[PDB]
Amino acid sequence: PIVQNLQGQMVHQAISPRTLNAWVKVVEEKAFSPEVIPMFSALSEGATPQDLNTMLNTVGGHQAAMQMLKETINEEAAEWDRLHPVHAGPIAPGQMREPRGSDIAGTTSTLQEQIGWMTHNPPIPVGEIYKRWIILGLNKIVRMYSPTSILDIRQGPKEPFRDYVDRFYKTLRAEQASQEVKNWMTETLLVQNANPDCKTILKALGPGATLEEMMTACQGVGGPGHKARVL
Amino acid sequence: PIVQNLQGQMVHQAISPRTLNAWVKVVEEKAFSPEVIPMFSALSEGATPQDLNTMLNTVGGHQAAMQMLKETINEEAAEWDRLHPVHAGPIAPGQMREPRGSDIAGTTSTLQEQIGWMTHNPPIPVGEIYKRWIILGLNKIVRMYSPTSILDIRQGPKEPFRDYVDRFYKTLRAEQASQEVKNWMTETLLVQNANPDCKTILKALGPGATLEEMMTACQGVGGPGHKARVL
Amino acid sequence: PIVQNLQGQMVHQAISPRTLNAWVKVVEEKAFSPEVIPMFSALSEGATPQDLNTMLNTVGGHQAAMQMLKETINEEAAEWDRLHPVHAGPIAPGQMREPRGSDIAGTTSTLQEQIGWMTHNPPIPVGEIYKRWIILGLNKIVRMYSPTSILDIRQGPKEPFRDYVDRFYKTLRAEQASQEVKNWMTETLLVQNANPDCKTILKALGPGATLEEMMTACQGVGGPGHKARVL
Amino acid sequence: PIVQNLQGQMVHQAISPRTLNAWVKVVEEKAFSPEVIPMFSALSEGATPQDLNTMLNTVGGHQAAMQMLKETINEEAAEWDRLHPVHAGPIAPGQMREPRGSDIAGTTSTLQEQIGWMTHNPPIPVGEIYKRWIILGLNKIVRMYSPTSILDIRQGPKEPFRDYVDRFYKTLRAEQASQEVKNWMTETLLVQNANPDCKTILKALGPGATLEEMMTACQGVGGPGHKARVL
Amino acid sequence: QGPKEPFRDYVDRFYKTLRAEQASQEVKNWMTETLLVQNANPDCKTILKALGPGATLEEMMTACQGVGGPGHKARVL
């Protein structure tokens, strides 16, 4: 995308074949897993809409998810053009004409105009909003993908604490809810779905317990072969 | 993170996709190993907090252990706001106001803002403290990984002394203790948890004779005080 | 390690991650092979003790061998500390003060001072001696690894000269003894450890046949010591 | 080796890590094959002896054959101290000292001194002769490898011309005779070692037929010919 | 510590034995915190573990004094 700083003005560079290969490979390896969202946020340097849209268009087997994501982007673009500060009428020549919801989209925007409003006038967050809409759509996909409704994870009488925690944190990452609520829910839910023996020693710790303390306490609860005891 | 020397002043640049793939493979196959702490130290190049923050969010496996590391960083950041000099608060125009304890974290500070206080005015150890807190979290993760104490690392009857030494040194890497204390322990521990048959010839060495000499003697004999044949 | 001469003033520049993966791949597959030792010398550009120390911290299973190498560096550092010219605490104001054994070691040294002493006052070979001590340590590890002796490598009944010479030369790199002696004993050894089928032709060639000349003759005979008298 | 032309005077740097891995990989794939000699010639850009010594030192499997080359290199170094200018022991103030046979090797010379004699007075062909001496040794190595001689090549009845000519071409890679002599060998041996039915095609075509024409006839007739005359 | 042995006799013997160790103060102190709990009988060990991390020697002795016997049994077994 558009880069260059200390050596002067920005130049529009193309995407790497290496990053494109990673996008194809990661999908074969772990298609809808939550870690895709921070990787996309981190790697998207100079996040221009049409360039971001290239990753969406190079979709393989997971095209159905992308089609839903595109509908969500269209809903978000429609909301931007009508429920947020609306664009006026005729203006004097040479002004950008405050970009519309459809101007954010790659289909209805040319490269010259898209880069023009991105840096000729003071930087507009056009890439940031489109990227945010993609993040919002990806969050919907991981939410739908999750096979467990958060409270479906349980610990069997022979299942170790570490595996119970792995299962619990796997569904926890797809929760998409408020942090205070998530902490309060985590505190009660972990105890409720725990096995009788595990729950009996877990209740000794009581209020004010934190994850570092919980992990430390469950070191003596051990793994397979070892028979977990209160003492 | 920040980079550039030969052409002039430092500018913020993202890490290679091959490096990210290398990290992903290391987390997948070497998960809780103490060998990953130097690998992370090498890969945590420069000093911008944002790149380290995104890198740690790419985990698909041991997310709960990583979350305990985030919790550790959050409470270490709390101590930077309280214990350490955080000044009076109000500041006259034209200053960068100095980061508070929670301003160190990439989740609470903007990228240009993070770069600003370490580039617009002379260096401050914001990258080093954030890295130190992550390293401290990794030290805690290997402390939870361990399932057997040093005195529980006993040598079996059919178990060779060489395998026992590897088990001891691998176990030792996660214990977090003073070098003098570890050396002082090394004098009696090595022959203490060994089996009777190998001890027959290894007890003859006596006082002094460092690990190198003890191993040179051990290699020369093999097995439980004498080697065995497979084919 | 430090880099740049023609280009400008010296820069301390981090190793590439591909180089680190290549080192890990070599250590993982070749373990205690003598082939690793020149590869370490080849890869260790601009000899900087901290970077050299980092390359000894990434080992997996074989940590105990690495610990012996680290103790060997301490042993040679101690040799520098008291048997090589002894330093005195009192020195004139404005001097960098030439390093003691502990200063050479990664344990008490700081990277800013370490780069400082090698770049300020006239060149001290701090990196080269540390690299040499590591190589000396690696040269002790091959002895620990080697499980054979000069008269244990004997050609079997169905073994050809190529298999017999390969085991001898594989062993030879880990010998750690005088070259002058090795040459003088080699002439006796090649005849002595041969099988009776190949021994008679080796004896028949006699004195005045060098390694190339013997290898040239041994190429045409065929099998595990084919008919030695052609009439 | 020493590198830089465009930005001014050359700086000494080590070999690239990827090149070192490639050298090891090529050895695993095809250590003794004749095309390794041009591959080595191509990769040895900047023939500084110390860098060249690293390539020799890092060899894996074929160590016994590899150590035979040192005898030839030492022998050519002995020839350099005889047939080439040998100079004298005395030396005038501040001179770099013209190389002796044992100054050529990196093992018995010092790097700064080595760069000094290669560059202080008009270039000395130290790297070029060392590469040629190594090539002479590599030409000896393919003699040791060789499983078939040039006069051992013969076409069987079930062996087509393409299979036969490939075998003949492979054996012509290391023919170790004059190009003038080789022209006669090519003209005579190719027809002479062909099978009777294939020979009939060659016999009919006869004198005044180039390699292009011979190949064209072989291509048109098919296989090694067939049980009845076509020409 | 045996099943019917009281903590005061056990810690008295531990201190007496430790008195002849002639090692640096750090070596003795660091060990004492973990070893006393580890070599204790199940019921006593449960009570010592219940007191847990932190606290002074006076606080530990105070807790032990009121506990009584060689360790009175619990209901979660």
Coordinates of C-alpha atoms in Angstrom, one line a residue, chain B:
Chain B
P1 CA 9.1 -2.0 15.7
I2 CA 11.4 0.9 15.2
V3 CA 14.3 0.5 12.8
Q4 CA 16.7 2.5 10.5
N5 CA 20.3 3.7 11.1
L6 CA 22.4 4.1 7.9
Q7 CA 19.9 6.4 6.1
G8 CA 19.1 8.4 9.3
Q9 CA 16.6 8.5 12.2
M10 CA 14.4 5.5 13.3
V11 CA 11.0 4.8 11.7
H12 CA 8.4 2.1 12.7
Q13 CA 8.4 -1.0 10.5
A14 CA 6.5 -4.3 10.8
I15 CA 8.3 -7.7 11.2
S16 CA 8.8 -10.2 8.3
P17 CA 5.9 -12.7 7.6
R18 CA 8.5 -15.5 7.6
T19 CA 9.5 -14.4 11.2
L20 CA 5.8 -14.5 12.2
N21 CA 5.4 -18.0 10.7
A22 CA 8.6 -19.1 12.6
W23 CA 7.1 -17.8 15.9
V24 CA 3.8 -19.6 15.1
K25 CA 5.7 -22.9 14.5
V26 CA 7.8 -22.4 17.7
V27 CA 4.6 -21.8 19.8
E28 CA 2.9 -24.8 18.2
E29 CA 5.8 -27.3 18.7
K30 CA 8.0 -25.9 21.6
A31 CA 4.9 -24.6 23.6
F32 CA 6.0 -24.4 27.2
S33 CA 9.8 -25.1 26.8
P34 CA 12.4 -22.8 28.5
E35 CA 14.2 -22.7 25.2
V36 CA 11.5 -20.4 23.9
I37 CA 12.5 -17.5 26.3
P38 CA 15.8 -16.8 24.4
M39 CA 14.0 -17.2 21.1
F40 CA 11.4 -14.6 22.1
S41 CA 14.2 -12.3 23.5
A42 CA 15.9 -12.4 20.1
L43 CA 12.6 -11.9 18.1
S44 CA 11.4 -9.0 20.3
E45 CA 13.6 -6.6 18.3
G46 CA 13.8 -2.8 18.8
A47 CA 11.6 -1.2 21.5
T48 CA 8.0 -0.4 20.3
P49 CA 5.3 -2.0 22.6
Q50 CA 2.7 -2.5 19.8
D51 CA 4.5 -5.3 17.8
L52 CA 5.1 -7.4 21.0
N53 CA 1.4 -6.9 22.0
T54 CA 0.1 -8.2 18.6
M55 CA 2.6 -11.1 18.5
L56 CA 1.4 -12.6 21.8
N57 CA -2.3 -12.5 20.5
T58 CA -1.5 -15.0 17.7
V59 CA -1.6 -18.1 20.0
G60 CA -4.1 -20.9 19.2
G61 CA -2.9 -23.5 21.7
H62 CA -2.1 -22.5 25.3
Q63 CA -4.2 -19.3 25.5
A64 CA -4.9 -19.5 29.2
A65 CA -1.1 -19.5 30.1
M66 CA -0.7 -16.5 27.7
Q67 CA -3.7 -14.8 29.5
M68 CA -1.9 -15.3 32.9
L69 CA 1.1 -13.5 31.2
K70 CA -1.2 -10.6 30.2
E71 CA -2.6 -10.5 33.8
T72 CA 1.1 -10.4 35.0
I73 CA 1.8 -7.5 32.6
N74 CA -1.3 -5.6 33.7
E75 CA -0.3 -5.8 37.4
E76 CA 3.4 -4.9 36.7
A77 CA 2.0 -1.9 34.8
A78 CA -0.1 -1.1 38.0
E79 CA 3.2 -1.0 40.0
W80 CA 4.7 1.5 37.4
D81 CA 1.7 3.8 38.2
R82 CA 2.1 3.6 42.0
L83 CA 5.6 2.6 43.2
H84 CA 7.7 4.3 40.5
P85 CA 7.9 8.1 39.8
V86 CA 4.7 9.2 38.0
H87 CA 5.0 13.0 38.7
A88 CA 2.3 15.5 39.9
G89 CA -0.1 15.1 36.8
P90 CA -0.8 18.7 35.5
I91 CA 1.9 19.9 33.0
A92 CA 2.5 23.2 31.1
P93 CA 1.9 23.4 27.3
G94 CA 4.6 22.0 24.9
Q95 CA 5.5 18.9 26.8
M96 CA 4.7 15.2 26.0
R97 CA 3.3 14.8 29.6
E98 CA 5.2 11.5 30.3
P99 CA 3.4 8.1 30.1
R100 CA 1.5 6.7 33.2
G101 CA 1.5 3.0 34.2
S102 CA -1.4 2.0 31.9
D103 CA 0.0 4.2 29.0
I104 CA 2.9 1.6 28.5
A105 CA 0.4 -1.0 27.2
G106 CA -0.5 -1.2 23.4
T107 CA -4.2 -1.7 24.2
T108 CA -4.4 1.7 25.9
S109 CA -2.0 4.0 23.8
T110 CA -2.2 4.9 20.1
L111 CA 0.8 4.0 17.8
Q112 CA 2.0 7.6 16.9
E113 CA 1.6 8.5 20.6
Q114 CA 3.8 5.4 21.6
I115 CA 6.5 6.4 19.0
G116 CA 6.3 10.1 20.1
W117 CA 7.6 9.9 23.7
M118 CA 10.5 7.7 22.7
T119 CA 11.5 9.6 19.5
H120 CA 10.5 13.3 19.8
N121 CA 12.5 13.6 23.1
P122 CA 15.5 11.5 24.3
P123 CA 15.0 7.7 25.0
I124 CA 12.9 6.3 27.9
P125 CA 13.0 2.5 28.7
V126 CA 9.3 1.9 27.8
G127 CA 10.2 -1.0 25.4
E128 CA 12.5 -2.6 28.0
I129 CA 10.1 -2.5 30.9
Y130 CA 7.2 -3.9 28.7
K131 CA 9.6 -6.7 27.4
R132 CA 10.7 -7.4 31.0
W133 CA 7.1 -7.8 32.1
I134 CA 6.5 -10.2 29.2
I135 CA 9.7 -12.2 30.1
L136 CA 8.6 -12.3 33.7
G137 CA 5.3 -13.8 32.5
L138 CA 7.2 -16.4 30.5
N139 CA 9.2 -17.3 33.6
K140 CA 5.9 -17.8 35.5
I141 CA 4.5 -20.0 32.6
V142 CA 7.5 -22.4 32.8
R143 CA 7.0 -22.4 36.7
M144 CA 3.4 -23.7 36.0
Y145 CA 4.6 -26.2 33.3
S146 CA 6.7 -28.2 35.8
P147 CA 4.9 -31.3 37.4
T148 CA 7.7 -32.7 39.6
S149 CA 10.1 -31.1 42.2
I150 CA 13.9 -31.5 42.0
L151 CA 13.9 -34.0 45.0
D152 CA 11.2 -36.0 43.1
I153 CA 13.6 -36.4 40.1
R154 CA 14.8 -39.9 41.2
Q155 CA 16.7 -42.4 38.9
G156 CA 14.9 -45.7 38.3
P157 CA 16.5 -49.2 38.5
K158 CA 16.7 -49.8 34.7
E159 CA 17.0 -46.1 33.9
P160 CA 20.5 -44.9 32.8
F161 CA 22.3 -42.0 34.6
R162 CA 22.7 -40.0 31.3
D163 CA 18.9 -39.7 30.7
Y164 CA 18.6 -38.7 34.4
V165 CA 21.1 -35.9 33.9
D166 CA 19.1 -34.5 30.9
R167 CA 15.8 -34.7 33.0
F168 CA 17.5 -32.9 35.9
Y169 CA 18.9 -30.0 33.6
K170 CA 15.6 -29.7 31.8
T171 CA 13.8 -29.6 35.1
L172 CA 16.4 -27.1 36.5
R173 CA 15.7 -24.5 33.7
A174 CA 12.2 -23.8 35.1
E175 CA 12.8 -23.6 38.9
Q176 CA 13.7 -19.8 39.1
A177 CA 16.5 -19.7 41.7
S178 CA 19.9 -18.0 42.6
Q179 CA 23.0 -19.2 40.9
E180 CA 25.0 -19.7 44.1
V181 CA 22.1 -21.8 45.6
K182 CA 21.9 -23.9 42.4
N183 CA 25.7 -24.5 42.5
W184 CA 25.7 -25.3 46.2
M185 CA 22.9 -27.9 45.6
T186 CA 24.8 -29.4 42.6
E187 CA 27.6 -30.6 44.9
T188 CA 25.3 -33.2 46.7
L189 CA 22.2 -33.5 44.4
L190 CA 23.9 -35.3 41.4
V191 CA 24.9 -38.4 43.4
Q192 CA 21.9 -38.2 45.8
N193 CA 19.1 -39.1 43.3
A194 CA 21.2 -41.7 41.4
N195 CA 20.5 -45.4 41.7
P196 CA 22.6 -47.9 43.8
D197 CA 24.2 -49.8 40.9
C198 CA 25.6 -46.6 39.1
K199 CA 26.5 -45.1 42.5
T200 CA 28.9 -48.1 43.1
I201 CA 31.5 -46.6 40.6
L202 CA 30.4 -42.9 40.8
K203 CA 30.9 -42.7 44.6
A204 CA 34.7 -43.4 44.1
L205 CA 35.3 -39.9 42.5
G206 CA 34.7 -38.0 45.8
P207 CA 35.0 -34.2 46.6
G208 CA 35.7 -31.6 43.9
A209 CA 35.8 -32.8 40.3
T210 CA 33.2 -30.5 38.4
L211 CA 30.3 -31.7 36.1
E212 CA 32.7 -32.0 33.2
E213 CA 34.9 -34.5 35.0
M214 CA 31.9 -36.3 36.5
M215 CA 30.4 -36.6 33.0
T216 CA 33.8 -37.6 31.5
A217 CA 33.9 -40.5 34.0
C218 CA 30.2 -41.3 33.4
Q219 CA 30.6 -41.4 29.6
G220 CA 33.5 -43.8 30.0
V221 CA 31.5 -46.4 31.9
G222 CA 27.8 -46.0 30.7
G223 CA 24.6 -47.8 31.9
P224 CA 24.1 -48.7 35.6
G225 CA 27.9 -48.7 36.3
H226 CA 28.5 -50.6 33.1
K227 CA 27.1 -50.3 29.5
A228 CA 24.6 -52.7 27.8
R229 CA 24.1 -54.0 24.2
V230 CA 21.0 -53.8 21.9
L231 CA 22.4 -55.6 18.8

